[PDB]
Symmetry: C3
Subunit: 234 residues, 3 copies
Amino acid sequence: IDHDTLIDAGGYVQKLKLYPYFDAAHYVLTCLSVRHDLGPDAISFSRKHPFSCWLSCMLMSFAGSFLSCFLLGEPIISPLKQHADILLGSIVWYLVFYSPFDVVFRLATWFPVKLGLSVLKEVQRTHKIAAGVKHAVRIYPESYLVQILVGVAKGAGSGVVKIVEQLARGTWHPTNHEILRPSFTTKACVIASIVFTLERHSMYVTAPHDLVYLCVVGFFIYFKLASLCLSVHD
Amino acid sequence: IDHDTLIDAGGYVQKLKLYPYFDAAHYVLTCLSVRHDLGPDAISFSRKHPFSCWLSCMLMSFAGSFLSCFLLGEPIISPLKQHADILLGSIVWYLVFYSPFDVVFRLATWFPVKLGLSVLKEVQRTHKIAAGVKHAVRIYPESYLVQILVGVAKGAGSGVVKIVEQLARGTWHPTNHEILRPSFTTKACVIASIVFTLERHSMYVTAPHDLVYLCVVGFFIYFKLASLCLSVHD
Amino acid sequence: IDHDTLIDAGGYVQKLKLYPYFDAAHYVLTCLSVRHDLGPDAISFSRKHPFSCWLSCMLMSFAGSFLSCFLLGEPIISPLKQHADILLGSIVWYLVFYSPFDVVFRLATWFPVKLGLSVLKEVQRTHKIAAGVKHAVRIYPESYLVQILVGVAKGAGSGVVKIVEQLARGTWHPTNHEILRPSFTTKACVIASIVFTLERHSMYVTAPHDLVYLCVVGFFIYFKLASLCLSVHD
Ligand SMILES: CCCCCCCCCCO[C@@H]1O[C@H](CO)[C@@H](O[C@H]2O[C@H](CO)[C@@H](O)[C@H](O)[C@H]2O)[C@H](O)[C@H]1O
Ligand SMILES: CCCCCCCCCCO[C@@H]1O[C@H](CO)[C@@H](O[C@H]2O[C@H](CO)[C@@H](O)[C@H](O)[C@H]2O)[C@H](O)[C@H]1O
Ligand SMILES: CCCCCCCCCCO[C@@H]1O[C@H](CO)[C@@H](O[C@H]2O[C@H](CO)[C@@H](O)[C@H](O)[C@H]2O)[C@H](O)[C@H]1O
Ligand SMILES: CCCCCCCCCCO[C@@H]1O[C@H](CO)[C@@H](O[C@H]2O[C@H](CO)[C@@H](O)[C@H](O)[C@H]2O)[C@H](O)[C@H]1O
Ligand SMILES: CCCCCCCCCCO[C@@H]1O[C@H](CO)[C@@H](O[C@H]2O[C@H](CO)[C@@H](O)[C@H](O)[C@H]2O)[C@H](O)[C@H]1O
Ligand SMILES: CCCCCCCCCCO[C@@H]1O[C@H](CO)[C@@H](O[C@H]2O[C@H](CO)[C@@H](O)[C@H](O)[C@H]2O)[C@H](O)[C@H]1O
Ligand SMILES: CCCCCCCCCCO[C@@H]1O[C@H](CO)[C@@H](O[C@H]2O[C@H](CO)[C@@H](O)[C@H](O)[C@H]2O)[C@H](O)[C@H]1O
Ligand SMILES: CCCCCCCCCCO[C@@H]1O[C@H](CO)[C@@H](O[C@H]2O[C@H](CO)[C@@H](O)[C@H](O)[C@H]2O)[C@H](O)[C@H]1O
Ligand SMILES: CCCCCCCCCCO[C@@H]1O[C@H](CO)[C@@H](O[C@H]2O[C@H](CO)[C@@H](O)[C@H](O)[C@H]2O)[C@H](O)[C@H]1O
Ligand SMILES: CCCCCCCCCCO[C@@H]1O[C@H](CO)[C@@H](O[C@H]2O[C@H](CO)[C@@H](O)[C@H](O)[C@H]2O)[C@H](O)[C@H]1O
Ligand SMILES: CCCCCCCCCCO[C@@H]1O[C@H](CO)[C@@H](O[C@H]2O[C@H](CO)[C@@H](O)[C@H](O)[C@H]2O)[C@H](O)[C@H]1O
Ligand SMILES: CCCCCCCCCCO[C@@H]1O[C@H](CO)[C@@H](O[C@H]2O[C@H](CO)[C@@H](O)[C@H](O)[C@H]2O)[C@H](O)[C@H]1O
Ligand SMILES: [Mg+2]
Ligand SMILES: [Mg+2]
Ligand SMILES: [Mg+2]
């Protein structure tokens, strides 16, 4: 009965209310990333330049939406009108950098938890890509390429914003073969985006959409979990 | 009677017609900055690539307006439609880089003068922030955050444009602890912006607006004059 | 009879249907450039990251249009709606990086051919600038400056996009006096742009427009051919 069960699981995941737990997971991981990139002085830095620190995290937390607006010519500022989102994001940021005894940070970096957060984040990423594709389809019905790129921007735009932040923080530097970091994330966002676009135009995808959705989420979680448990071979 | 006098001084400064003297002060200082950043070959460089040099100065001279348009999704080109402004800016730029015997440059870098120009510039910056907040309020009445960010963009956006220019000129490089430059400008623009935003929504500011205005300008001039007379302790 | 013949040649060149041969020439040269900038591992790189490689070439192939939209506040994505163009561009890109035995690449880099392609590209660049000016004139009838800048953006915007790509690829680095590369391209686009703008407002240009057009194209081809045959003195 798998294929009837799987179909239900897919519709299940696809209907999950992301706010506020799946969103918070993404914010937490995003803040941890900004904190890791800030260095050993991260805490001193955050206490001396809170506005800058807060900004660095908000930009990364909503990177996909900023890039998306940029591509579509919508006010870059748009995302900041999701008051609930910005508030939740600022609270997480406050907790990650300033919780007493740094408990939040310590709890979030404990492997079992970081792993649970990563799963929730992948679920949320899949939703961002799908939403991005749907939004693009409503604006440019016949532009398959735009639809795909927008979907990818919503799912992997953090890379662009990171560069922007490292330039503004004066730390950007070439990345010419320092280490071998095998990341399939953005390539996976491309595939997911194409798949959702095709699905939206009912073409090569004859499979039940709720099942395809399950597979996309499944692959995201897989590749993500693989890189977390491993280091160089999956 | 101070508080009646002060109130008048505040309304006074707030009504000052910025064009063309307060504007020219800002243009002069902006051009001097681009010239200092260009190096020893600045003059040879400017004589070989005048269009590029002119562009570098216009971008910096109107940085706040370009960033503002960028954030609001308005044509980035908008600022260039202020013919009088662009003309005055181009004239100042021409004089700073090409005046015979370099008199303009020499006069502008003479401490007493550079100090007078700095005062006028701070007065103009305060007006940019306030105007930015008002503009944002008219477009997004309930978005306090957007209003603040726009105000800050109008007051401290030159930092973004500078990076853009150093990338286009091929000179950008990390700024990892070369020297200890204590600049409170942008942090002050943040405060000023918040204050004007609050003031616009008549909340925590029970003080006479014209008096608050005086304080903001006063603090800008102070922090600015402090950094000019000092080097590492104020 | 030259001046009657020349006038005809000018109207001639100006009416040339750019698609698909003049366009393909530009795409081919653009792809060769991205390939040269990718290095010795270019081929391995392209086979491991095709989506990224394809993107790098599309961004450069339509750089002028992306910058133009950016300046005018039009959706940055707009250019991708020229399906025929994007298809032709993707096909050229596919052929340049993956043709069997690399014949396309080998044929395109054979001096006589690269020289022929360069001529066609210069013809196309002239058309981009003129189109850019006309577009700007229709939107902002009295903004001479905007009209000129837009024209220049359409003709020399690839420089901006290149920087963007080197940042995203993690290879950007200062260009502080490594070699002496004498490029007059963008300075020539500035002149061409001013000339077309003036021409559009029927001012200082009393010369037959079709003749001026011929001269502009002629100068582009000249400066371009000069740099190709030479290395340091023309
Ligand atoms: C409720 C809304 C509150 C948020 C409002 C908007 C927040 C303001 C964002 C800009 O913050 C700036 O960030 C810079 C860093 O990019 C700091 O540069 C300072 O700190 C840097 C390092 O972080 C140094 O490199 C610089 O030299 C030094 O000037 C600067 O002080 C700070 O003001
Ligand atoms: C100097 C920077 C400091 C910024 C301070 C400004 C904060 C302004 C908050 C005013 O509106 C808030 O809206 C929140 C929602 O966004 C509410 O949260 C409550 O309501 C939300 C739903 O509206 C739920 O999500 C929350 O979990 C629940 O705590 C909260 O009660 C309410 O006061
Ligand atoms: C990175 C480290 C992680 C940071 C740590 C912060 C985690 C916060 C855990 C919140 O746990 C929630 O607590 C709610 C109470 O606030 C519960 O509400 C539920 O139970 C309440 C009673 O306890 C009822 O009043 C509510 O209506 C019912 O929704 C809800 O089930 C539970 O998930
Ligand atoms: C530290 C890492 C480990 C953390 C793992 C815990 C994650 C907690 C996030 C909770 O997410 C919620 O899950 C609910 C279910 O429990 C969903 O109920 C929803 O979905 C159900 C079906 O799955 C329906 O039956 C319900 O009616 C409907 O409210 C709801 O949308 C979703 O926000
Ligand atoms: C009335 C309106 C008039 C203004 C119209 C628009 C002005 C044109 C802006 C672009 O100017 C370009 O600036 C580049 C610099 O960013 C120069 O690069 C040249 O100079 C650089 C150094 O400044 C070098 O690094 C480069 O290699 C070299 O090609 C290039 O020659 C020049 O054309
Ligand atoms: C190759 C680059 C060279 C660019 C040359 C193109 C210049 C075009 C100027 C034509 O319009 C100008 O407008 C100026 C105003 O912007 C006037 O200045 C006069 O009028 C202004 C007010 O309109 C005052 O601000 C000035 O101080 C006063 O000199 C000036 O008379 C007038 O000719
Ligand atoms: C960085 C180095 C600084 C660069 C040096 C350039 C400074 C230019 C100084 C201008 O001084 C102005 O001269 C005006 C004359 O052009 C005067 O007009 C005034 O006086 C004129 C008579 O002199 C009358 O005709 C006018 O109506 C009356 O407005 C005005 O008061 C005075 O401020
Ligand atoms: C080298 C550095 C040292 C330079 C210092 C000199 C600065 C000169 C800038 C002149 O600024 C003007 O000041 C006028 C006053 O003199 C103002 O008159 C205006 O404001 C007055 C009140 O202050 C009113 O009484 C007037 O009617 C009204 O025209 C006018 O707006 C303003 O542009
Ligand atoms: C029909 C439409 C198809 C096109 C859809 C959109 C194409 C997707 C564009 C982004 O492609 C990304 O480019 C990155 C490069 O900028 C790659 O980074 C990888 O490769 C880089 C080198 O090229 C390394 O520096 C990075 O560390 C490494 O993660 C990444 O894998 C790849 O996904
Ligand atoms: C995974 C990435 C792979 C992408 C595959 C998607 C391609 C979709 C193609 C469908 O429409 C195409 O339009 C082309 C035009 O753009 C046509 O070319 C033909 O028609 C054109 C004019 O429409 C001419 O320019 C061409 O030379 C001629 O081959 C072609 O027949 C037709 O099928
Ligand atoms: C960088 C290396 C370069 C890459 C190599 C790819 C170059 C492709 C060459 C195409 O040559 C074209 O072939 C067409 C045929 O497909 C001809 O059509 C013409 O001749 C055909 C018969 O051969 C007729 O059917 C057509 O109607 C008539 O338009 C056309 O004249 C000719 O220019
Ligand atoms: C490897 C480098 C060397 C490659 C050099 C070969 C370049 C081939 C590109 C062909 O460009 C076409 O030339 C046609 C002429 O042959 C033009 O016919 C057009 O223009 C003619 C006038 O020039 C008119 O008579 C025609 O009716 C009209 O169709 C047409 O627009 C244009 O696309
Ligand atoms: Mg949704
Ligand atoms: Mg005003
Ligand atoms: Mg045309």
